[PDB]
Design a protein around this ligand. Structure first.
Ligand SMILES: CC1CCN(C(=O)Nc2ccc(O)cc2)CC1
Ligand SMILES: CC1CCN(C(=O)Nc2ccc(O)cc2)CC1
Lengths: 193, 193
């Protein structure tokens, strides 16, 4: 039951590595999951709902990893603090490139996908701003831009930059350079005047 | 002739203020331009080609404004130098929000739109890196990240951040804050260690 659901989700993530959702049939999903078409429709209303669930899983994995880090202060300098945090997203989304690529595309055509991404971006921005504010309150960061506005632009930079790198877009930062690139921009913009 | 082409382009930019391209018919474009449907097809093969031409116009307007600025060094500090440059894009795309919004969306479904945007982003990144390199050669900026990689991430931040602001996305930087926000991140990341 739960196991036929997991098989459908696994089949979908596998087929998205090779082609876009548009080119994947419900037949392809049911065949890969070893069920019939009408059995598929018991578990999901459409191939679009499958992608929504895959993206929901990946986004919550990143969020839950960030929560784990927020509980356990890693014993490091300000640069390493931000690098470990950005790295949650680099590794989580980087480990699910096909779901990442298809989910970002679906935002255009799915209000549920757009709303999921929006909800988590607001959470990540809020957390970023809360850390910047703590750094200002302890005297480690200068009171420059409004923290929420700075957090918003930095999170949008990471969204666009990591997705471009993982998709191999032209232009993009090479994947093996993107973490250093983003950490430099975060640290200089948070701590600089 | 040229004037029926301009009427079609004007009608398209007007109708995109109120609805997406998907909800605009060739009938709507020909009616607004005061021509028949088959006359429309003399000037453009599809509503999609009209949008391509509108986006081509806006992108070249930004590029030509940046070229004008690159010829005429405005007599200012490093912060004002970058602000005037970012402002070309803020004003040019901000003055064509409907075409901006529809063009960014069309990148998903039009190889010509994706290629146009890619070509100009590569040009803007190359120019950004050339300015950073000049600033390093004159001793005004430190030799930190590879200039092309830094330029790439900063240009992708501006792409995503300006489009989110103009679309009123949640989340976004308010339009009246986005220029200050982006200038701060550019200057601190270019001149900071
Ligand atoms: C405390 C911070 C650490 C750094 N974080 C980010 O990297 N956000 C991020 C990454 C990739 C995305 O697509 C969107 C957002 C935010 C939370
Ligand atoms: C010398 C620089 C000045 C600042 N520039 C930018 O603002 N780029 C930019 C703006 C909006 C976009 O969508 C994409 C790129 C680059 C050229």
């Amino acid at each position: 039951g739960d196991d036929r659901e997991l098989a459908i989700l696994a089949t979908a993530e596998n087929l998205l590595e090779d082609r876009p959702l548009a080119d994947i049939s419900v037949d392809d999903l049911a065949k890969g999951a070893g069920i019939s078409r009408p059995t598929f429709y018991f578990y999901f209303p459409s191939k679009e709902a499958v992608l929504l669930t895959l993206l929901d899983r990946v986004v919550n994995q990143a969020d839950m990893a960030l929560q784990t880090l927020a509980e356990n202060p890693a014993d490091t300098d300000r640069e390493n603090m931000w690098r470990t945090g950005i790295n949650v997203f680099f590794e989580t989304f980087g480990s699910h490139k096909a779901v990442t690529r298809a989910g970002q595309a679906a935002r255009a055509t799915s209000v549920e996908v757009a709303e999921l991404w929006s909800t988590f971006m607001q959470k990540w921005i809020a957390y970023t701003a809360a850390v910047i504010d703590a750094e200002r309150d302890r005297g480690a960061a200068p009171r420059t831009l409004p923290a929420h506005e700075l957090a918003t632009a930095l999170n949008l930079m990471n969204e666009r930059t990591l997705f471009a790198s993982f998709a191999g877009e032209q232009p993009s930062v090479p994947e093996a350079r993107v973490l250093d690139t983003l950490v430099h921009i975060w640290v200089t913009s948070i701590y600089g005047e």
